Amino acid sequence: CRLPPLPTIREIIKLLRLQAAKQLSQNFLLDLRLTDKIVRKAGNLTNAYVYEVGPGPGGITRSILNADVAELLVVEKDTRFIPGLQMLSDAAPGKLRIVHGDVLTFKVEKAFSESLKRPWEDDPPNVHIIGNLPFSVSTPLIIKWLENISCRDGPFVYGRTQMT
Amino acid sequence: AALVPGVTQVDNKSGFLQKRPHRQHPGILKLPHVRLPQALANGAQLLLLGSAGPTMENQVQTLTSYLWSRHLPVEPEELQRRARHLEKKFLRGAVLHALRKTTYHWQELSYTEGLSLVYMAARLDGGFAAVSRAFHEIRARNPAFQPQTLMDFGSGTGSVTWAAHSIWGQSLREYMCVDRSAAMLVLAEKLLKGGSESGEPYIPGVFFRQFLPVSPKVQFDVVVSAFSLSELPSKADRTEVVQTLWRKTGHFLVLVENGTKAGHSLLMDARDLVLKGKEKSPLDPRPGFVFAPCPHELPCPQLTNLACSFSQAYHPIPFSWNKKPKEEKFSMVILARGSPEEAHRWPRITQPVLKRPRHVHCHLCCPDGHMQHAVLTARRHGRDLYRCARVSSWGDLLPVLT
Amino acid sequence: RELPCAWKPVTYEEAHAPHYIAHRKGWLSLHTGNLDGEDHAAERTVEDVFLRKFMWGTFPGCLADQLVLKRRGNQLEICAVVLRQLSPHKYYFLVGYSETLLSYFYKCPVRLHLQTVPSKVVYKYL
RNA sequence: GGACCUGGCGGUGCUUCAUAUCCCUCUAGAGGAGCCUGUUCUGUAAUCGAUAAACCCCGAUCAACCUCACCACCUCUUGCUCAGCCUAUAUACCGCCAUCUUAACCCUGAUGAAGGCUACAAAGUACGUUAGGUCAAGGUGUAGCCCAUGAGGUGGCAAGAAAUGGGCUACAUUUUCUACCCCAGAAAAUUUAGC
Ligand SMILES: C[S@@+](CC[C@H](N)C(=O)[O-])C[C@H]1O[C@@H](n2cnc3c(N)ncnc32)[C@H](O)[C@@H]1O
Ligand code: SF4
Ligand SMILES: [Mg+2]
Ligand SMILES: [Mg+2]
């Protein structure tokens, strides 16, 4: 697929309207080889439904898209990255669904189809979560999802969904 | 020789002659006087409000003439043959002094903030017209082409980006612009935002980079280089850039230079380089052919002593020194992937057409690889073809068959 | 070998700029044509142009300095300054030839007043 | 790996001031009418194309009921004179215009990279280039067409609309007309430069 180029740090700074390299207050992985490695460790994503959290520039998003996924749901809090993700979606028709919101409050149990729900006692239900979030947000998120696994609800209504 | 009196006849496909007048014959590629977009013209003047006085008129003129008269850098090999010849005549220090004369001193231009404004005031309007004429070639003869991607090596002021928008604005979605100078990139973005540091870009999807990407995997629909290969320090640099640009070309590679001997020779090096493929197993195996202006892939018949250039008249950006319309003399070559569409290629008029009583002078580059000075008249060639040549102009095609 | 590797005395007259023509420098040609009322200034100019060209073409490498073209009525005095490199017999032969040819070209009694110098008289260095 | 030397910082901010160019300040106009042009669109078979070559003879001027150019039709050609064309070429030369290129010595640091100032003074001194323009006050060649790029005739052609660029006129009461050359009589918002 012909995907648009990964934004550079200068483009990121201008997009965030910071005009400087010191007021960024954020770290990005703008190397597609490392993102490829991460998505490789995430497992076989052929015709899989992936829930991506905290994309930002979209290196992980591009690496997932290069893998032959069926539908990639992408939840982003910052509006300023949504134009770039929309260009990415235009590049790949129908494989990318952008949503604005907090991952701490977004409801995933309704996002995907009900035909992907498999029993708990079976293998993982072809739905994966991948995330490179700020470290101030991943700990609350993993606590919340551990509670959800305890209740077998939220992202785990589909079954034993794997997380990376 | 594509004109044989009494034998060569007009080529009537689509039922042309019956269905349309002669002034609109398919070889007509003339473009009316080019006017820049108002957003560009307004932006350029706004950026110059700080300093556009009498000094700027002199500076713009000095830069314009200096760039026009530039010669290609003298490769070392040319230098020793000159050195030995002067050595034999004298029969080392004396030869060098006699070599500083009779040889061109080629220098880099470091496009800083100051010299970037002078360039924009001197070449924005002129460069825009030349590229618009080149793109008109692709649109007029292939109107179904709807590119979605464009790269511009040597993006100084963004003239290529603006020109591409004016023709393929409804389908282009990515404009990759490359330029090593930080100031030129800074100036080019201001021009997209209405000439202000803060604003909304007038064209969407423009990407600015300082280094040329080198990868065959990423391939662009239209790759453009306008008045940029003449700034490279050597023939090796020109060789390497043109190879990369061709490797990343999807449909068309548009190269545009000054209409001088230095410019024309530069493009014929690049024309031969792409035609004579050297890569053993390229990622894209498709061949290349000259979409325009040449009707053949054989060596240029005018490269020996003459040049080959074309003209496009345009309206200069209103300034304290721009009153009358100007003409932009430029050299171009367009290289297209694949093979020629058909075998019915038509000669190219490469020189002003001289209209005289009952006869017309046309200088044609013919498909067989030879120039032909044809004096067309109604008695010898026929009523139709004479009228077609009567209305034709510099840079058009002549529809002749057999 | 490579482009990065590849990349004066004056006489009194050569030393001085044009704006000293009436301050420090003089005039080489002298005639009444340009005066107010006098006529044929253009003809005298053309005469001087041809005459300088012909003197420089007839005495190659001998003229140390520019000529001085003076005019008294018909008379045309070419007061030239030459060198002492060429043999005196050739000076005499050339003087006779040039005087006769110029007299028959301008239809006036042309004359030559060579002044030989051992070498060019330098004033300064520029 | 330890210590040191020259640095460059293609540097970044603040403080103070010199702070002229540009600001504020002063004078003057520059919107509107009427016509002529540059460019665009539309239209024609065609050129609202030109007068060392016509009307126009107040200023100017348009089409002239002129000739050349254009469109559609036709005629002649050994014609003029071993004819004739102004047809190209300075993208053939020349000429003319224009572009661009063309130090030494002496000290200090143990004789290391290296450094060298104090005035009531402490080592510092001495020609080419051009697919360039010009065939109007200039030339030397070179090519083309000669049953037509020559010579004629019969008709037609003489545009329409805008938005913007430029230009020409009249525009007044501190004016206008007469006598005089100044004591009379009658009339009625942006910009742009400039000191
Ligand atoms: C003469 S400008 C071209 C103008 C532009 N094409 C236009 O139409 O306005 C050439 C630009 O190429 C850039 N350039 C020169 N050498 C380069 C190189 N080696 N790699 C990338 N850019 C280069 C210069 O900085 C300059 O801005
Ligand atoms: S059009 Fe003909 S003369 Fe011009 S560059 Fe191509 S081959 Fe050469
Ligand atoms: Mg010329
Ligand atoms: Mg007419």
Coordinates of N, CA, C and O and ligand atoms in Angstrom, one line a residue, chain B residues 264 268 271 293-296 298-303 307-308 310 332 348 350 365 371, ligand 2:
Chain B
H264 N 20.5 23.3 -22.4 CA 20.1 22.3 -23.3 C 21.1 21.1 -23.3 O 20.6 19.9 -23.3
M268 N 20.2 17.0 -22.3 CA 20.5 16.0 -23.2 C 21.3 14.9 -22.5 O 21.3 13.7 -22.9
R271 N 18.7 13.1 -20.7 CA 17.8 12.4 -21.6 C 18.5 11.1 -22.0 O 17.8 10.0 -22.1
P293 N 9.9 17.1 -25.6 CA 9.4 17.6 -26.9 C 9.9 16.8 -28.0 O 9.5 17.0 -29.2
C294 N 10.8 15.9 -27.8 CA 11.4 15.2 -28.9 C 10.5 14.1 -29.5 O 9.8 13.4 -28.7
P295 N 10.3 14.0 -30.8 CA 9.5 12.9 -31.3 C 10.3 11.6 -31.6 O 9.8 10.7 -32.3
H296 N 11.4 11.5 -30.9 CA 12.3 10.3 -31.1 C 13.2 10.1 -29.9 O 13.3 11.0 -29.1
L298 N 16.4 9.0 -30.6 CA 17.7 9.1 -31.2 C 18.4 10.4 -30.7 O 17.7 11.3 -30.2
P299 N 19.7 10.5 -30.9 CA 20.4 11.7 -30.3 C 19.9 13.0 -30.9 O 19.4 13.0 -32.0
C300 N 20.0 14.0 -30.1 CA 19.6 15.4 -30.5 C 20.3 15.9 -31.8 O 21.5 15.9 -31.8
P301 N 19.6 16.3 -32.8 CA 20.3 16.8 -34.0 C 20.7 18.2 -33.9 O 21.5 18.7 -34.8
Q302 N 20.3 18.9 -32.9 CA 20.7 20.3 -32.6 C 21.8 20.5 -31.5 O 22.2 21.6 -31.3
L303 N 22.2 19.4 -30.9 CA 23.1 19.5 -29.8 C 24.5 19.8 -30.2 O 25.3 20.2 -29.4
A307 N 21.2 25.0 -30.0 CA 20.4 24.5 -28.8 C 19.0 24.2 -29.2 O 18.7 24.2 -30.4
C308 N 18.2 23.9 -28.2 CA 16.8 23.7 -28.4 C 16.0 24.2 -27.2 O 16.2 23.7 -26.1
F310 N 12.3 26.7 -25.9 CA 10.9 27.0 -26.2 C 10.6 28.3 -25.3 O 11.3 28.6 -24.4
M332 N 13.3 22.0 -22.0 CA 12.5 21.0 -21.3 C 12.7 19.6 -21.9 O 13.0 19.5 -23.1
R348 N 8.0 18.3 -34.3 CA 7.9 19.4 -33.3 C 8.5 20.7 -33.9 O 9.6 20.6 -34.4
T350 N 10.4 23.8 -33.4 CA 11.4 24.1 -32.3 C 11.9 25.6 -32.4 O 12.9 25.9 -31.8
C365 N 11.8 19.3 -35.9 CA 12.5 18.1 -35.5 C 11.6 17.0 -35.8 O 10.5 16.8 -35.3
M371 N 16.5 17.3 -38.3 CA 15.8 18.6 -38.5 C 15.5 18.8 -40.0 O 16.2 18.4 -40.9
Ligands
SF4_2 S1 12.9 18.4 -29.9 FE1 14.5 17.8 -31.4 S2 16.0 19.6 -31.3 FE2 14.8 19.7 -29.4 S3 15.9 18.6 -27.8 FE3 14.4 17.1 -28.8 S4 15.6 16.1 -30.5 FE4 16.8 18.0 -29.9

